[PDB]
Short mmCIF file of C-alpha atoms and ligand atoms in Angstrom, two decimals:
data_model
loop_
_atom_site.label_atom_id
_atom_site.label_comp_id
_atom_site.label_asym_id
_atom_site.label_seq_id
_atom_site.Cartn_x
_atom_site.Cartn_y
_atom_site.Cartn_z
CA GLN A 1326 38.26 2.87 -3.72
CA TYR A 1327 38.46 3.89 -0.06
CA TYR A 1328 37.19 0.82 1.79
CA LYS A 1329 39.06 -2.49 1.70
CA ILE A 1330 37.17 -5.76 2.23
CA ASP A 1331 39.60 -8.49 1.23
CA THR A 1332 40.34 -9.93 4.66
CA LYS A 1333 38.45 -10.27 7.92
CA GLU A 1334 40.50 -7.48 9.47
CA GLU A 1335 39.89 -5.15 6.52
CA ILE A 1336 36.16 -5.84 6.67
CA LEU A 1337 36.08 -5.11 10.39
CA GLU A 1338 37.85 -1.80 9.89
CA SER A 1339 35.64 -0.80 6.96
CA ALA A 1340 32.53 -1.75 8.92
CA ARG A 1341 33.73 0.30 11.89
CA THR A 1342 34.18 3.40 9.73
CA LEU A 1343 30.84 2.79 7.99
CA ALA A 1344 29.21 2.52 11.42
CA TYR A 1345 30.72 5.90 12.32
CA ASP A 1346 29.50 7.55 9.12
CA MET A 1347 25.98 6.18 9.52
CA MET A 1348 25.87 7.36 13.13
CA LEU A 1349 26.63 10.94 12.05
CA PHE A 1350 23.09 11.09 10.64
CA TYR A 1351 21.59 10.20 14.01
CA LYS A 1352 21.07 12.92 16.59
CA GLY A 1353 18.75 11.10 18.99
CA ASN A 1354 21.33 10.56 21.72
CA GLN A 1355 22.06 14.29 21.94
CA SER A 1356 20.52 16.56 24.54
CA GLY A 1357 17.10 17.79 23.47
CA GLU A 1358 16.64 15.21 20.70
CA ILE A 1359 14.42 12.12 20.51
CA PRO A 1360 16.10 8.72 20.86
CA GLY A 1361 15.37 6.08 18.29
CA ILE A 1362 14.58 8.19 15.23
CA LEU A 1363 16.52 9.65 12.35
CA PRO A 1364 15.74 13.27 11.43
CA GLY A 1365 12.15 13.67 10.32
CA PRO A 1366 9.44 13.13 9.53
CA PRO A 1367 9.43 14.98 6.20
CA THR A 1368 5.76 15.86 6.76
CA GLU A 1369 6.99 18.20 9.56
CA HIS A 1370 10.03 19.44 7.60
CA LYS A 1371 12.27 18.02 10.33
CA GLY A 1372 14.25 15.73 8.04
CA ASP A 1373 13.98 13.07 5.37
CA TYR A 1374 13.09 9.96 7.36
CA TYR A 1375 10.09 8.30 8.92
CA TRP A 1376 9.88 6.64 12.34
CA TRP A 1377 10.13 3.07 11.05
CA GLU A 1378 13.53 3.82 9.53
CA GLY A 1379 14.79 4.53 13.03
CA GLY A 1380 13.74 1.02 13.91
CA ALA A 1381 15.56 -0.28 10.85
CA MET A 1382 18.67 1.60 11.96
CA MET A 1383 18.45 0.11 15.46
CA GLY A 1384 18.33 -3.40 14.04
CA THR A 1385 21.23 -2.67 11.69
CA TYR A 1386 23.35 -1.83 14.74
CA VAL A 1387 22.19 -4.86 16.71
CA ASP A 1388 23.47 -6.88 13.73
CA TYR A 1389 26.63 -4.74 13.51
CA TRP A 1390 27.61 -5.65 17.06
CA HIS A 1391 26.67 -9.30 16.54
CA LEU A 1392 28.78 -9.49 13.36
CA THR A 1393 31.83 -7.46 14.44
CA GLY A 1394 31.97 -7.71 18.22
CA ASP A 1395 32.20 -3.92 18.45
CA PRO A 1396 29.89 -2.76 21.31
CA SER A 1397 30.66 0.96 20.92
CA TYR A 1398 27.10 1.93 19.93
CA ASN A 1399 25.19 -0.56 22.08
CA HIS A 1400 24.17 2.00 24.71
CA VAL A 1401 22.86 4.41 22.06
CA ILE A 1402 20.89 1.61 20.40
CA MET A 1403 19.40 0.31 23.64
CA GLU A 1404 18.26 3.85 24.48
CA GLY A 1405 16.70 4.30 21.05
CA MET A 1406 14.90 0.96 21.05
CA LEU A 1407 13.49 1.51 24.55
CA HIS A 1408 12.36 5.05 23.88
CA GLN A 1409 9.97 4.04 21.07
CA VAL A 1410 8.11 1.14 22.74
CA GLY A 1411 5.00 3.14 23.65
CA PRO A 1412 3.03 3.05 26.88
CA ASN A 1413 1.88 -0.52 26.25
CA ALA A 1414 5.31 -1.88 25.32
CA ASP A 1415 4.11 -2.84 21.85
CA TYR A 1416 5.79 -0.36 19.50
CA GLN A 1417 2.54 1.60 19.12
CA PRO A 1418 3.48 4.98 20.57
CA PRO A 1419 0.37 7.10 19.85
CA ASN A 1420 2.26 10.23 18.94
CA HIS A 1421 3.21 8.29 15.78
CA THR A 1422 -0.32 7.16 14.81
CA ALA A 1423 -0.01 8.69 11.33
CA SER A 1424 3.03 6.41 10.63
CA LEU A 1425 1.43 3.36 12.25
CA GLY A 1426 1.27 0.64 9.72
CA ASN A 1427 1.74 -3.01 10.39
CA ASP A 1428 5.00 -2.67 8.44
CA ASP A 1429 6.26 0.18 10.61
CA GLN A 1430 5.38 -1.61 13.84
CA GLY A 1431 6.68 -4.83 12.35
CA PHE A 1432 10.15 -3.44 11.65
CA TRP A 1433 10.50 -2.37 15.28
CA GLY A 1434 9.27 -5.78 16.42
CA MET A 1435 11.79 -7.42 14.11
CA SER A 1436 14.61 -5.37 15.60
CA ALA A 1437 13.54 -6.53 19.08
CA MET A 1438 13.39 -10.12 17.83
CA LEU A 1439 16.89 -9.69 16.41
CA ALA A 1440 18.11 -8.36 19.75
CA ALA A 1441 16.86 -11.53 21.43
CA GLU A 1442 18.34 -13.75 18.71
CA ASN A 1443 21.69 -11.97 18.90
CA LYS A 1444 21.84 -11.93 22.71
CA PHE A 1445 22.00 -8.14 22.62
CA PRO A 1446 22.37 -6.92 26.24
CA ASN A 1447 19.07 -6.90 28.07
CA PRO A 1448 17.34 -3.68 29.12
CA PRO A 1449 17.11 -2.95 32.86
CA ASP A 1450 14.91 -5.24 34.87
CA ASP A 1451 12.03 -2.74 35.05
CA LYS A 1452 12.02 -2.11 31.28
CA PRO A 1453 10.45 -4.17 28.48
CA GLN A 1454 12.66 -7.07 27.41
CA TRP A 1455 13.51 -7.83 23.77
CA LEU A 1456 11.59 -11.09 23.40
CA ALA A 1457 8.57 -9.57 25.18
CA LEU A 1458 8.59 -6.63 22.78
CA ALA A 1459 8.63 -8.94 19.75
CA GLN A 1460 5.82 -10.98 21.34
CA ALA A 1461 3.81 -7.81 21.90
CA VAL A 1462 4.10 -6.72 18.29
CA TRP A 1463 3.18 -10.19 17.07
CA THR A 1464 0.24 -10.46 19.48
CA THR A 1465 -1.22 -7.12 18.43
CA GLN A 1466 -0.80 -8.18 14.80
CA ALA A 1467 -2.66 -11.42 15.53
CA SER A 1468 -5.54 -9.57 17.21
CA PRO A 1469 -8.88 -10.45 15.64
CA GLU A 1470 -9.79 -6.94 14.44
CA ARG A 1471 -6.72 -7.01 12.17
CA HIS A 1472 -7.99 -10.19 10.39
CA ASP A 1473 -11.30 -9.59 8.65
CA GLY A 1474 -12.95 -11.50 5.81
CA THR A 1475 -12.02 -9.17 2.97
CA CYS A 1476 -9.78 -11.03 0.52
CA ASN A 1477 -10.43 -14.08 2.76
CA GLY A 1478 -7.92 -12.67 5.28
CA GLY A 1479 -4.54 -10.96 5.42
CA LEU A 1480 -3.42 -7.85 7.23
CA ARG A 1481 -4.11 -4.39 5.95
CA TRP A 1482 -1.15 -2.07 5.44
CA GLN A 1483 -2.34 0.45 8.05
CA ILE A 1484 -3.50 -0.04 11.63
CA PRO A 1485 -5.93 2.87 12.10
CA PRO A 1486 -9.04 2.50 9.90
CA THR A 1487 -8.87 6.21 9.07
CA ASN A 1488 -5.26 6.14 7.79
CA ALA A 1489 -4.83 6.45 4.04
CA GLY A 1490 -3.97 2.99 2.78
CA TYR A 1491 -6.15 1.00 5.19
CA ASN A 1492 -7.81 -0.48 2.07
CA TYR A 1493 -4.47 -1.86 0.77
CA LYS A 1494 -3.68 -5.41 1.92
CA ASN A 1495 -0.01 -5.51 1.04
CA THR A 1496 2.83 -7.98 1.11
CA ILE A 1497 5.04 -6.11 3.55
CA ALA A 1498 2.51 -5.97 6.40
CA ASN A 1499 1.89 -9.68 6.05
CA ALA A 1500 5.58 -10.50 5.52
CA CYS A 1501 6.55 -8.74 8.74
CA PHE A 1502 3.90 -10.66 10.68
CA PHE A 1503 4.92 -13.93 8.97
CA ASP A 1504 8.62 -13.36 9.68
CA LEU A 1505 7.96 -12.52 13.34
CA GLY A 1506 5.80 -15.59 13.78
CA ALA A 1507 8.38 -17.88 12.21
CA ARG A 1508 11.15 -16.38 14.35
CA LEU A 1509 9.10 -16.49 17.54
CA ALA A 1510 8.33 -20.15 16.82
CA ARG A 1511 12.02 -21.01 16.45
CA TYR A 1512 13.07 -19.04 19.51
CA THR A 1513 10.31 -20.13 21.91
CA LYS A 1514 9.44 -23.53 20.42
CA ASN A 1515 5.78 -22.51 20.68
CA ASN A 1516 3.81 -23.92 17.78
CA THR A 1517 1.01 -21.34 17.83
CA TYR A 1518 3.46 -18.85 16.35
CA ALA A 1519 4.23 -21.34 13.59
CA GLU A 1520 0.60 -22.10 12.81
CA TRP A 1521 -0.08 -18.39 12.29
CA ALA A 1522 3.02 -18.04 10.12
CA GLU A 1523 1.84 -20.99 7.98
CA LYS A 1524 -1.63 -19.41 7.66
CA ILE A 1525 -0.28 -16.02 6.57
CA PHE A 1526 2.17 -17.50 4.07
CA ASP A 1527 -0.61 -19.63 2.60
CA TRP A 1528 -2.74 -16.49 2.29
CA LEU A 1529 0.06 -14.60 0.49
CA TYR A 1530 0.35 -17.53 -1.89
CA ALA A 1531 -3.42 -17.91 -2.41
CA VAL A 1532 -4.03 -14.20 -3.04
CA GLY A 1533 -1.27 -14.36 -5.67
CA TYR A 1534 1.14 -11.82 -4.21
CA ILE A 1535 3.58 -14.73 -4.56
CA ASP A 1536 3.58 -15.68 -8.21
CA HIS A 1537 2.73 -19.39 -8.41
CA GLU A 1538 4.94 -19.90 -11.46
CA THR A 1539 7.90 -17.55 -11.00
CA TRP A 1540 7.92 -16.93 -7.22
CA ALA A 1541 8.18 -13.22 -7.86
CA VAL A 1542 6.72 -11.31 -4.90
CA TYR A 1543 4.39 -8.45 -5.82
CA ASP A 1544 3.45 -5.52 -3.64
CA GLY A 1545 -0.26 -5.82 -2.75
CA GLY A 1546 -3.88 -5.31 -3.76
CA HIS A 1547 -6.95 -3.44 -2.53
CA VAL A 1548 -9.94 -4.78 -0.63
CA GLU A 1549 -12.49 -3.11 -2.90
CA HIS A 1550 -11.22 -5.35 -5.73
CA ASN A 1551 -10.96 -8.46 -3.56
CA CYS A 1552 -7.18 -7.88 -3.74
CA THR A 1553 -7.17 -8.78 -7.46
CA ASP A 1554 -5.74 -5.44 -8.64
CA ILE A 1555 -2.23 -6.65 -7.89
CA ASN A 1556 0.44 -3.97 -7.86
CA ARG A 1557 3.19 -5.93 -9.55
CA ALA A 1558 6.03 -3.75 -8.35
CA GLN A 1559 8.73 -6.08 -7.00
CA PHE A 1560 10.53 -4.48 -4.07
CA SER A 1561 13.57 -6.42 -2.92
CA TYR A 1562 12.62 -6.38 0.75
CA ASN A 1563 9.32 -8.21 0.14
CA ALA A 1564 10.81 -11.29 -1.48
CA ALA A 1565 13.81 -11.24 0.87
CA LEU A 1566 11.61 -11.04 3.98
CA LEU A 1567 9.54 -13.99 2.81
CA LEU A 1568 12.75 -15.91 2.13
CA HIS A 1569 13.97 -15.08 5.64
CA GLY A 1570 10.76 -16.22 7.32
CA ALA A 1571 10.57 -19.35 5.17
CA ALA A 1572 14.11 -20.23 6.23
CA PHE A 1573 13.10 -19.94 9.88
CA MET A 1574 10.09 -22.18 9.16
CA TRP A 1575 12.31 -24.73 7.36
CA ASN A 1576 14.71 -24.76 10.28
CA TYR A 1577 11.92 -25.09 12.86
CA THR A 1578 9.66 -27.60 11.07
CA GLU A 1579 12.10 -29.57 8.90
CA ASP A 1580 9.15 -29.88 6.51
CA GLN A 1581 10.23 -30.28 2.88
CA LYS A 1582 7.48 -27.88 1.81
CA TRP A 1583 9.39 -25.09 3.55
CA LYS A 1584 12.69 -26.16 1.98
CA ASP A 1585 11.00 -25.97 -1.42
CA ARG A 1586 9.63 -22.49 -0.61
CA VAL A 1587 13.10 -21.33 0.47
CA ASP A 1588 14.59 -22.66 -2.75
CA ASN A 1589 11.89 -21.20 -4.99
CA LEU A 1590 11.95 -17.78 -3.32
CA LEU A 1591 15.74 -17.75 -3.53
CA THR A 1592 15.73 -18.67 -7.22
CA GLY A 1593 13.38 -15.76 -7.84
CA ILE A 1594 15.46 -13.29 -5.83
CA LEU A 1595 18.69 -14.22 -7.61
CA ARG A 1596 16.93 -13.91 -10.98
CA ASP A 1597 15.14 -10.65 -10.28
CA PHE A 1598 17.26 -8.55 -7.93
CA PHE A 1599 20.88 -9.52 -8.60
CA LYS A 1600 22.35 -8.03 -11.76
CA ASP A 1601 25.84 -9.37 -12.54
CA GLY A 1602 26.07 -10.17 -8.87
CA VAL A 1603 24.85 -6.81 -7.50
CA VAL A 1604 21.56 -6.13 -5.72
CA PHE A 1605 19.38 -3.71 -7.72
CA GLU A 1606 16.11 -2.11 -6.63
CA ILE A 1607 14.19 -2.92 -9.79
CA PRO A 1608 11.06 -0.71 -9.23
CA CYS A 1609 13.07 2.51 -8.96
CA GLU A 1610 16.86 2.23 -9.40
CA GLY A 1611 16.77 2.18 -13.22
CA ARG A 1612 16.94 5.93 -13.22
CA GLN A 1613 18.03 8.46 -10.67
CA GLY A 1614 15.46 10.47 -8.75
CA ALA A 1615 12.77 7.77 -8.37
CA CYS A 1616 13.55 5.80 -5.20
CA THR A 1617 11.89 7.04 -2.00
CA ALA A 1618 13.73 7.28 1.32
CA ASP A 1619 12.21 3.97 2.33
CA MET A 1620 13.37 2.19 -0.84
CA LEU A 1621 16.97 3.33 -0.33
CA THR A 1622 17.16 1.06 2.75
CA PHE A 1623 15.97 -2.18 1.17
CA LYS A 1624 19.23 -3.53 -0.20
CA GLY A 1625 20.75 -3.44 3.31
CA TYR A 1626 17.95 -5.65 4.61
CA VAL A 1627 18.43 -7.95 1.63
CA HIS A 1628 22.08 -8.45 2.59
CA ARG A 1629 21.51 -8.89 6.31
CA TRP A 1630 18.52 -11.20 5.95
CA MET A 1631 20.02 -13.34 3.17
CA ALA A 1632 23.19 -13.74 5.24
CA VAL A 1633 21.14 -15.12 8.14
CA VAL A 1634 19.37 -17.46 5.72
CA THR A 1635 22.74 -19.13 5.12
CA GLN A 1636 23.02 -19.92 8.84
CA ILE A 1637 19.58 -21.36 9.41
CA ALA A 1638 19.14 -22.94 5.95
CA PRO A 1639 22.78 -23.96 5.39
CA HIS A 1640 22.09 -25.69 2.08
CA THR A 1641 21.66 -22.19 0.60
CA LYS A 1642 25.13 -20.99 1.59
CA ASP A 1643 26.87 -21.48 -1.75
CA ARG A 1644 24.04 -19.84 -3.67
CA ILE A 1645 23.98 -16.77 -1.42
CA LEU A 1646 27.38 -15.88 -0.01
CA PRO A 1647 29.22 -15.45 -3.34
CA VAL A 1648 26.50 -13.13 -4.59
CA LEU A 1649 26.43 -11.06 -1.40
CA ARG A 1650 30.19 -10.75 -1.80
CA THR A 1651 30.01 -9.32 -5.32
CA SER A 1652 27.15 -7.05 -4.27
CA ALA A 1653 29.12 -5.74 -1.27
CA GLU A 1654 32.17 -5.21 -3.50
CA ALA A 1655 30.05 -2.98 -5.72
CA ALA A 1656 28.70 -1.17 -2.63
CA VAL A 1657 32.18 -0.24 -1.46
CA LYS A 1658 33.49 0.54 -4.95
CA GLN A 1659 31.12 3.54 -5.12
CA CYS A 1660 31.67 4.77 -1.54
CA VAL A 1661 34.09 7.38 -2.79
CA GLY A 1662 32.03 10.55 -2.76
CA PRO A 1663 33.01 14.00 -1.58
CA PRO A 1664 33.48 15.68 0.80
CA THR A 1665 35.05 12.78 2.71
CA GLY A 1666 36.31 10.58 -0.14
CA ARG A 1667 34.21 7.76 1.27
CA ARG A 1668 30.60 8.98 1.04
CA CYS A 1669 28.22 6.23 -0.05
CA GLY A 1670 25.58 6.38 -2.74
CA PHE A 1671 22.89 3.95 -3.83
CA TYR A 1672 23.68 3.03 -7.42
CA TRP A 1673 26.01 0.13 -6.75
CA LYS A 1674 25.49 -1.72 -10.01
CA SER A 1675 26.34 1.46 -11.96
CA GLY A 1676 29.83 1.46 -10.51
CA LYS A 1677 29.76 5.19 -9.83
CA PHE A 1678 29.08 7.43 -6.86
CA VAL A 1679 25.83 9.38 -7.20
CA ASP A 1680 25.18 12.14 -4.68
CA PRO A 1681 22.23 11.12 -2.43
CA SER A 1682 20.79 14.59 -3.11
CA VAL A 1683 19.54 13.21 -6.45
CA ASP A 1684 17.05 11.20 -4.40
CA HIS A 1685 16.27 14.13 -2.11
CA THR A 1686 17.72 12.86 1.17
CA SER A 1687 20.88 13.38 3.16
CA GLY A 1688 21.92 9.76 2.41
CA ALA A 1689 21.22 7.86 5.64
CA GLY A 1690 19.54 4.92 3.90
CA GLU A 1691 22.47 4.47 1.52
CA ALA A 1692 24.88 4.60 4.44
CA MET A 1693 22.76 2.09 6.35
CA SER A 1694 22.66 -0.27 3.37
CA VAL A 1695 26.43 -0.25 2.87
CA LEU A 1696 26.99 -0.79 6.59
CA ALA A 1697 24.61 -3.74 6.44
CA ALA A 1698 26.24 -5.26 3.36
CA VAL A 1699 29.81 -4.92 4.61
CA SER A 1700 29.05 -6.10 8.16
CA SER A 1701 27.21 -9.14 6.81
CA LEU A 1702 30.40 -10.25 5.00
CA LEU A 1703 31.34 -11.51 8.46
CA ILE A 1704 28.38 -13.93 8.70
CA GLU A 1705 30.64 -16.99 8.40
CA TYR A 1706 32.26 -16.07 11.72
CA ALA A 1707 29.03 -15.21 13.53
CA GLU A 1708 26.89 -17.29 15.80
CA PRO A 1709 23.53 -18.30 14.35
CA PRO A 1710 20.37 -16.80 15.88
CA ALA A 1711 19.90 -18.08 19.41
CA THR A 1712 16.81 -19.86 20.63
CA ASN A 1713 15.55 -19.94 24.20
CA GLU A 1714 18.11 -22.72 24.80
CA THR A 1715 20.93 -20.17 24.92
CA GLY A 1716 19.27 -16.77 24.68
CA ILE A 1717 19.24 -14.34 27.59
CA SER A 1718 16.05 -12.35 26.93
CA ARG A 1719 12.71 -12.90 28.71
CA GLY A 1720 9.18 -13.04 27.35
CA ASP A 1721 5.80 -11.98 28.68
CA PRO A 1722 2.69 -14.20 28.35
CA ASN A 1723 0.57 -11.05 28.33
CA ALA A 1724 2.63 -9.14 25.77
CA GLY A 1725 0.15 -7.12 23.73
CA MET A 1726 -2.75 -7.85 26.11
CA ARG A 1727 -2.82 -4.84 28.40
CA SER A 1728 -6.23 -3.41 29.18
CA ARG A 1729 -5.09 0.00 27.91
CA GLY A 1730 -3.82 -1.58 24.69
CA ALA A 1731 -5.06 0.06 21.51
CA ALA A 1732 -7.02 -3.06 20.45
CA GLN A 1733 -9.36 -2.39 23.40
CA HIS A 1734 -10.63 0.85 21.89
CA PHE A 1735 -10.49 -0.03 18.21
O1 MAN B 941 5.64 4.86 -1.06
C1 MAN B 941 5.38 4.51 -2.42
C2 MAN B 941 4.63 3.18 -2.51
O2 MAN B 941 3.45 3.23 -1.70
C3 MAN B 941 2.62 2.07 -1.67
C4 MAN B 941 2.25 1.61 -3.09
O3 MAN B 941 1.28 2.43 -3.72
C5 MAN B 941 3.46 1.58 -4.02
O4 MAN B 941 3.10 1.33 -5.39
C6 MAN B 941 4.26 2.89 -3.96
O5 MAN B 941 5.44 2.76 -4.78
O1 MAN B 942 8.64 1.48 -0.12
C1 MAN B 942 7.80 0.53 -0.77
C2 MAN B 942 6.57 0.38 0.05
O2 MAN B 942 5.89 1.65 0.00
C3 MAN B 942 4.72 1.70 0.79
O3 MAN B 942 4.98 1.37 2.16
C4 MAN B 942 3.68 0.67 0.31
O4 MAN B 942 3.38 0.82 -1.07
C5 MAN B 942 4.31 -0.70 0.33
O5 MAN B 942 3.41 -1.73 -0.11
C6 MAN B 942 5.63 -0.71 -0.50
O6 MAN B 942 6.25 -1.98 -0.39
CA1 CA B 943 3.99 3.71 7.58
CA1 CA B 944 14.31 15.70 1.64
#
């Protein structure tokens, strides 16, 4: 094993080197390249990765700085986040229409929310501010045209009606909107965010994407079947995102119903995704060559989000932190690949390095996930998410409401 994680100082060093290796994948700060994206999209034969994964990377580094105190990449990350906001400061740049799902937009909004929560340095005064960007994403996701009567509500996966998948009302789109609402409620103390989050969670429960008995979290269903054709694939990021949002709702509301939802979601996650203490992507990891580029990132979100759950729902700490520790140990045990002696693969539970080429990418998602898992070992030393009591960001009451906003020509 190359990386050592047995003390705070070892974890900091390992995380620093992991942050370096992940950054090698990113070219967006170089002359002639596009800030905020990893190489791609694969539809243009430019690389393995889609736009939203750039947003995921940005958030990973906002967390990295928050967890380690290392600001080395902050300028690169600010540039990347600001470059992708779009003309209406809502993370709907039109050049990316083909990739514009509520999930894709949601992940960028969640990185902006995280920047506000983590007191990440503010953009210049003339540029969109982190809280305002999260508010804009949330507001566009709350817009009435995104909430029709099919399946008695819920967001569709895609934003443009002509995008393939507009007929799929899926967990992730709704989970992103739920999580943003819960987090905006806690930060701003505005209850309209919370009422929407309650409504969307109740919809996810009613439609049965949350299993009423087991609290498994399925993937989605299609409008032409009234959402009854449930795709029962259980992706780790869906349950973990609902856990994260539920923890924010528990912290904000202090309502026992939210504590029960936290506990039930957490029981399900530990049962389903942790195998001998190691996170495992059950829909695809069972054999090599099945996980998509997107799926290779999920276990990093699981670690980062579950670690925050322990701060805002502290009664969960002893259920979560020991399991994140064993999962992160497995992550680093297999970061031993050539040519560097420290290259990271995906198959942590297996105990062995597998070349990311088996899954047809250069390995950025695997690198991101290990960075996330190792950094998040420092959660016990980190400040909890800030609210507007101590945060430094600024909001915008008209976030998402510009007259040139896409909702105005839907
Ligand atoms: O990107 C792959 C993913 O897309 C969406 C759903 O159809 C899933 O079942 C599938 O696994
Ligand atoms: O990567 C998994 C992811 O793939 C696609 O985005 C859709 O099928 C989603 O519902 C699913 O969660
Ligand atoms: Ca997409
Ligand atoms: Ca490829």
